[PDB]
């Protein structure tokens, strides 16, 4: 009956419940119309649920992209903001393109941004990439680093193989059974 978060988003409420029900405490997704959602727990589970809110830093703030600092609707645009808006849509597009592989569930790709070489006649340095991925289990993920290091090697101008780092891992154990109501 006691509430602990309110005015939440849809994806914020679907992440708080997913964190809480993993630790044997069940919650309630109460809608409120225009004022968002609200999440209520029972009374003996309140002490543990505030602790896991503090530990996991919930509610999740929205994810940041570089193209939000330099918006396209500005009145003027520098070439530093045009090159930073180009690279921010390429690293957003390779991440979309890595989820269509065999077994990948999520991925995150980073590009080395270069700014200070655009004004002077010195040539810009080489471009560095880095990726993360989460595979489902049963996959031999030791031999699947050489397919990402081959896919995103010649997706740019000229990288080396030791300028690409792939840190991938298997997913956690699945959660399928219900938590269970407190017996009072």
């Amino acid at each position: 009956d006691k509430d602990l978060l309110k005015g939440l988003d849809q994806e914020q409420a679907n992440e708080v419940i997913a964190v809480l029900q993993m630790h044997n405490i069940e919650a309630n997704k109460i809608d409120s119309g225009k004022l968002g959602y609200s999440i209520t727990v029972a009374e003996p589970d309140f002490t543990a649920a505030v602790y896991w809110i503090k530990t996991y830093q919930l509610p999740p703030r929205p994810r940041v992209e570089i193209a939000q600092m330099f918006p396209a609707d500005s009145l003027v645009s520098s070439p530093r903001a045009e090159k930073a808006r180009l690279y921010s849509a390429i690293e957003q597009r390779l991440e979309q393109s890595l989820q269509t592989m065999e077994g990948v569930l999520s991925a995150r790709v980073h590009i080395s941004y270069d700014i200070d070489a655009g004004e002077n006649g010195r040539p810009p340095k080489p471009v560095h990439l880095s990726a993360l991925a989460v595979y489902e289990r049963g996959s031999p993920l030791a031999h699947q680093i050489s397919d990402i290091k081959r896919f995103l090697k010649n997706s740019f101008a000229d990288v080396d193989y030791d300028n690409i780092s792939v840190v991938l891992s298997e997913r956690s154990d699945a959660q399928l059974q219900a938590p269970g109501t407190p017996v009072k």
Partner: protein
């Protein structure tokens, strides 16, 4: 209500063992199931006394008692594949204990585990503990460096390793630590760049580094 029905639906990821001091131990197998079983007994829907044990936690609980009442002892790991009869893996070539003293050690280790029935003490060779550690370190083609000294060896894996060699050097260390512990043999994986970064040097017993085409530096013999 019984305790085995107050846990989840799946009645296979827990095992309830009756103690010997009017208690009831629950044997979880990882941290996630340990927090799952501790939420039940902490919210208070059970009118009796019960505990939640774990293999990693109990292995340090009866290693705190053992470095106070039995110092200067050489052992590896306690195995809980059958939680009513744990197996104590002792060292053979580093202890001076007779059989009568092992009977007393097997009796004093039983009182710290009231759920157990009879602790079984077995001794193993001190050579195969480092032989399996070097044989598994040679299959993955990892460059290493063995340092032998008294009461333990040490394997040092340094350099600028690539991504498949950090993954194969982590999947092996976790599988070795799960079965042998970290008392005797210890791996030191250390990711660092090339020492003397781009500098030319002249090595061996009279060393100098060339900091520049007209600059000599004379540290320790490289």
């Amino acid at each position: 209500a019984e305790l085995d029905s107050l846990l989840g639906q799946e009645k296979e990821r827990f095992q309830v063992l009756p103690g010997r001091d009017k208690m009831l131990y629950v044997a979880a197998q990882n941290e996630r199931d340990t927090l799952w079983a501790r939420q039940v007994l902490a919210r208070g829907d059970y009118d009796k006394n019960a505990r939640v044990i774990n293999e990693n936690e109990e292995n340090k609980r009866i290693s705190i008692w053992l470095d106070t009442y039995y110092p200067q002892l050489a052992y590896y790991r306690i195995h809980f594949d059958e939680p009513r009869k744990p197996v104590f893996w002792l060292s053979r070539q580093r202890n001076t204990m007779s059989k009568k003293e092992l009977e007393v050690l097997s009796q004093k280790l039983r009182a710290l585990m009231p759920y157990a029935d009879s602790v079984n003490i077995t001794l193993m060779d001190d050579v195969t503990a480092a032989g399996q550690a070097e044989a598994g370190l040679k299959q993955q083609a990892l460059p290493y460096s063995r340092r032998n000294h008294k009461g333990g060896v040490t394997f040092v894996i340094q350099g600028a390793l690539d991504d498949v060699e950090i993954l194969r050097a982590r999947q092996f260390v976790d599988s070795y630590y799960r079965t042998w512990g970290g008392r005797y043999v210890q791996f030191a994986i250390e990711l660092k760049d090339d020492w003397l970064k781009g500098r030319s040097f002249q090595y061996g017993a009279e060393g100098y580094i060339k900091m520049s085409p007209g600059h000599w530096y004379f540290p320790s013999p490289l």
